[PDB]
Amino acid sequence: WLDDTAKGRQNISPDKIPWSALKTLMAQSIYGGRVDNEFDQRLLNTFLERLFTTRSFDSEFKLACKVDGHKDIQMPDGIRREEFVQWVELLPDTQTPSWLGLPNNA
Amino acid sequence: KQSVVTLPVYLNFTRADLIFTVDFEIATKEDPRSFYERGVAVLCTE
Numbered sequence: 001w002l003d004d005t006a007k008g009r010q011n012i013s014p015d016k017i018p019w020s021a022l023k024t025l026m027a028q029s030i031y032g033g034r035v036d037n038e039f040d041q042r043l044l045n046t047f048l049e050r051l052f053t054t055r056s057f058d059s060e061f062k063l064a065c066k067v068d069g070h071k072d073i074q075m076p077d078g079i080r081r082e083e084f085v086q087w088v089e090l091l092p093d094t095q096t097p098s099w100l101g102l103p104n105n106a
Numbered sequence: 107k108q109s110v111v112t113l114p115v116y117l118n119f120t121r122a123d124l125i126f127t128v129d130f131e132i133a134t135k136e137d138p139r140s141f142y143e144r145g146v147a148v149l150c151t152e
């Protein structure tokens with residue numbers, strides 16, 4: 001879909017990214033094909049709608065909330081794969097289930 | 107005959123036997139997306 005949208009262009013405005021196409025196709029064909037329950041489908045749709053907008057690649061995007069008290073996993077501002085993997089390697093060793101959106105007592 | 111959230115009702119803790127859907131009401135400061143992501147549901151035996 002990125003090759004379809006971009007005719008070899010170097011950059012795309014984030015509004016022109018096929019967000020609806022990616023969300024619908026991923027929620028109905030790839031990850032939603034295995035999904036049985038309507039509630040599981042609703043949860044997958046909620047995850048895709050929350051994650052695949054980013055306010056059109058805006059900065060200070062909130063990926064999750066690590067701790068309810070003053071802790072957020074903000075979106076990295078990198079552009080390159082090396083920057084993204086360096087941000088990934090920076091993640092702290094401790095992980096709570098609130099990273100996943102689940103309650104901490106799970 | 108005729109925000110809000112829809113929560114499943116399950117026969118047990120396994121969440122494998124859906125009974126029926128219940129339409130509750132949400133508080134002012136809460137969020138339906140957080141309700142859906144936290145896996146809020148209603149059981150029958152626990």
